[PDB]
């Protein structure tokens, strides 16, 4: 409704559209995360029965299907419908989003498909950051840059299985952000820096933690 | 060992693509139309994620006595996801209605009206009693309107893939929501024979042959049991 009334009345409109596309995938992904925590808790305490266990597996598979469907739709909308009309900023936003989506597909898939997805997410995150560095003034502390960094860091820590490198990556981004400070930072920048520092805090202690990603 | 499975959701993927292509490339003039398509696809995905929650509802309610908290989380997600299908499908419908006329192509107008038929069918799966019956009635209207437009405007309509996709969704409404599986199968049979009596030994489109297969498979499963 918010997005509808705005569109009914193209630059940050594309950004607005792209934020709604992100939300298609992350909304269903968040609900599945809730189901799995609940499942983990349930099964920690209880044996259940074979029928119930199957229903739960069925439900998870329904949610994963839907995440894969949304991800696939959105990647293609970004390539076919958004990218040729985007300015460098929206374009970078969209390339980051494609990395997020390749990452969410890799959380779900196995075998060679999983690996193909993690590789493409590396490719997009790397390409988004390079683009960001070339046009963003004061890129080290820009929130689009820090959110791309943050999300790449979660790819590095988990899917790529390099906790130490992920933490090094985050810490060097925090440092570079702080070295740029003068030249107050935006609310979004401070929010992202706190997530970076909070993730690092957990990782320093030998724990994956929440692996909090960017709120956009 | 379902290589049919990877083929099935690849068809679901092709379907989403086609919704957005049509809404977005059939117009005579948009970001709003992209959003309408994007939302149709979202709503289909929200519905898809709930299918086992729905078809196993009695098993799930049964488990709530001894497994309260888990089943409550499931119930809460279902309520929220269904609120979303209801609210966002009305969003898509409003967008379609405000822009319907800006599709000069007769096929594209029928496409949008079938789509409203689908979205009404979705609301009908969620809603209860009369509110449900009114959505079923509105879905009937939309399907019959789209079918009539397809009959009027489409070349060799009985074997046209949009025509057959419309038959199939109306058949689904008849089978499930209308509680008339026999009426549904006669309806499907009728359209199979009408399509076949179209065409030399001419080849139909791949999407026609896919839809005729689905229609045939469904009648036979009903005929055998």
Author numbering:
A (entry chain A): 46 to 54, 60 to 233, 236 to 268
B (entry chain B): 30 to 58, 62 to 231, 233 to 258
Sentences from the paper on this structure:
One protein family common to humans, C. parvum and in fact all eukaryotes is the group of tyrosine 3-monooxygenase/tryptophan 5-monooxygenase activation proteins (YWHA), also known as 14-3-3 proteins. All 14-3-3 proteins are dimers, with each subunit comprised of nine α-helices framing a peptide-binding cleft. The dimer is shaped like the letter “W” from one angle, with an un-partitioned bicameral pocket where a substrate protein is held at two typically phosphorylated sites in the two component clefts. The parasite Cryptosporidium parvum has three 14-3-3 proteins: Cp14ε, Cp14a and Cp14b, with only Cp14ε similar to human 14-3-3 proteins in sequence, peptide-binding properties and structure.
While Cp14ε conformably binds a number of known 14-3-3 ligands and Cp14a attracts none, the third C. parvum 14-3-3 protein in our study stands out by interacting with a peptide that is a phosphorylated copy of the last six amino acids in its own C-terminus: LLT(pS)AFF – a motif hitherto not known to be relevant in the context of 14-3-3 proteins. Protomer 1 follows the standard 14-3-3 architecture, albeit with the helix αB1 atypically disordered (and hence not visible in the crystallographic structure). The bound tail features a phosphorylated serine and the sequence LLT(pS)AFF. This serine, which was found to be phosphorylated in the crystal structure despite the fact that the protein was expressed in E. coli, interacts with the Arg79-Arg153-Arg154 triad just as the mode 1 peptide does in Cp14ε, with the backbone of Cp14b's tail tightly aligned with the peptide RAI(pS)LP and fitting in the binding groove in a very similar way. In contrast, the other subunit of Cp14b, namely protomer 2, has a disordered C-terminus in our crystallographic structure; however, this polypeptide displays its own unique feature. Specifically, the helices αA2 and αB2 appear as one continuous helix, behaving like a bent spring given room to relax and straighten. The resulting “super” helix, dubbed αAB2, is shifted from where αA and αB are typically found. In its new position, αAB2 blocks access to the binding groove and potentially contributes to inhibition of Cp14b's ability to bind another protein, as seen in Figs. 5D and 5E from two different angles. With protomer 2 adopting a conformation with only 8 helices, Cp14b can no longer form a dimer in the same way as other 14-3-3 proteins, which rely on helices A and B configured as a bent spring. The novel dimer, held together by hydrophobic interaction, does not form a merged and undivided substrate cradle. Instead, the two binding grooves face opposite directions and are separated by helices αC1, αD1, αAB2, αC2 and αD2. The division and twisting of this cavity makes it impossible for the chaperone to hold a substrate in the standard way and potentially forms a third mode of inhibition for Cp14b.
